[PDB]
Amino acid sequence: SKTFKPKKNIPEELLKHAEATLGSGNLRQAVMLPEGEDLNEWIAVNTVDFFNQINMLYGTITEFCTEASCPVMSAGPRYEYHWADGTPIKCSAPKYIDYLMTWVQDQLDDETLFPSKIGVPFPKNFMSVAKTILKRLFRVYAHIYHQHFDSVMQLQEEAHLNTSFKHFIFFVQEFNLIDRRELAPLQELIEKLG
Amino acid sequence: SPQAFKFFMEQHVENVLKSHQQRLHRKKQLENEMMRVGLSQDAQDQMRKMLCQKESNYIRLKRA
Ligand SMILES: [Zn+2]
After folding, report:
1. In chain B, what residues touch A42 (CB-CB under 8 Å)?
2. Which residue of A12, A80, A147, A175 has the fewest C-beta atoms within 10 A of its own C-beta?
3. Which 3 state secondary structure label does DSSP give B63?
4. Chain A contact for B54, CB < 8 A?
5. Which residues contact B23 (CB under 8 A, 6 or more apart)?
6. Can you give the residue ranges of every domain in chain B?
7. Quick one: CA dihedral B36, B39, B42, B45, positive or negative?
8. Which helix H or strand E contains B30, and what residues bound it?
9. What region, left, alpha or beta, does residue A114 occupy, with left being phi > 0 and alpha being psi -120 to 50 degrees?
10. Chain A partners within 8 Å of B16 (Cβ)
11. Total structural domains within chain A
12. Domain at A23, CATH number
């Protein structure tokens, strides 16, 4: 709300390379909570997987994402992001994303948030914690899609990106883990994947 | 180089699907044997519960 600043002062692509994917199969069914499975656990394992994918995704285009090319964290001109973790900064996309990925990593390493021992329950607020992570992880996708799809197509990794993002968004949507407002930066890519 | 991201995503999609069908498979196997020997619905539900907890434990461990 302070971290997510859409810009009403802006008058309002090739992104719809969206058919390009790998073997997603029945992905809508894949993201569903299996009968008897704990939602927290299911959120946790997928959040970790998505983090890994996104961590690798950004690794491919980080050379192209610099202070010069991206002096403010954005998802196109109509959306800017300021960093804050409650434990807000106008900063560049590389700075923001470094803050973000360290932050997410610390959560996942936090055994009190993401317990790895059998028998140890999730914290009472795990859902809210998971929702902030996924909310902010979405921004890497959005930044890359808006600012660096040229470099993605250069590396011929559009299919791999779409696959990752499609799965991410199908998961997010299944459990309503991100407010439709914050998904604004990619509404039409998303509507194109459903 | 983007080769690791690429290889992982190509490998990831089929891993997702395999994990999904393996859960179903173990679920089907349990139902099959239960029905074969004709256990009480209480005993069946207990063991279904046990399978679910084991599957839960499994993905926690994969995450670890
Ligand atoms: Zn950038």
Report:
1. 59
2. A12
3. helix
4. no
5. A34, B55
6. 1-64
7. negative
8. helix B3-37
9. beta
10. 25, 27, 30, 167
11. 1
12. 1.20.140.30
